[PDB]
């Protein structure tokens, strides 16, 4: 992101925690601006000897090296819970062919058969039909109803 986060004279908005008393734990966000106690003497909110600010600016300039030019980093973490999983893939579909023995796969129900233009009258919320013996015989096409 050099052209964006690097400007003439340098960009110093982005910082980094320079001192910390412990290594961070997974996904741990620490924004504390406590003046770091580098020594044994407490700082009491006064900068000085062994009392240094935790955050330091970044060197982002157009003429900087690649190792120091700005980079925009996005980390995506996938979480599974004891809940409905609401983020999915696109799941593109294929064409619809009738009057031919095809191995279909509609919304969730799969099978093999010939798909023909039926004259059954589903209700608007109903998705597929069942026979007297719990066998699916009619399916509403998800793309065109």
């Amino acid at each position, epitope marked *: 992101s050099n052209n964006l986060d690097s400007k003439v*004279g340098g960009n110093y*908005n982005y910082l980094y925690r320079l001192f910390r008393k412990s290594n961070l734990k997974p996904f741990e966000r620490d924004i504390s601006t406590e003046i770091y106690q580098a020594g044994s003497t407490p700082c009491n*909110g006064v*900068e000085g000897f062994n009392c*240094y600010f935790p*955050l*330091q600016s970044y060197g982002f300039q157009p003429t900087n090296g690649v190792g120091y030019q700005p980079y925009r980093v996005v980390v995506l973490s996938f979480e599974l819970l004891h809940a409905p999983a609401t983020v999915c893939g696109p799941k593109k579909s294929t064409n619809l062919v009738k009057n031919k023995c095809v191995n279909f796969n509609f919304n969730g129900l799969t099978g093999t058969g010939v798909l023909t233009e039926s004259n059954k009258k589903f209700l608007p919320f109903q998705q597929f039909g069942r026979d007297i013996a719990d066998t699916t015989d009619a399916v509403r096409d998800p793309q065109t109803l």
Partner: nanobody
Amino acid sequence: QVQLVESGGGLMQAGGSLRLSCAVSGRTFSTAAMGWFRQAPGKEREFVAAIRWSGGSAYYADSVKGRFTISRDKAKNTVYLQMNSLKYEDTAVYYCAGSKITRSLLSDYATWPYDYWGQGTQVTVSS
């Protein structure tokens, strides 16, 4: 956009006190730090005092420690320069300055560049 409006100061006797202000409008310097500069005739402009805008921790030059006091008010967006214990050598035009850069070392603000500056206020010491 950004303007630094100084007020107060002028002529004061030896041993007297002055207090300077610098109102910033159109910009806030939360993580950055503001500083003061003075230029005696025939000499280069030098660092006076800086204060961290968010934290209030103040850093001073060697020749100004113990006589000058800097403070800032976030609400009023104006920095103060309490200037006690005058010396004749302080005679110079004081400039309130602003920089866009955030620095861990509060001493770095005496050397690091400033992108915003005031109009300059004359300070004269009389005996």
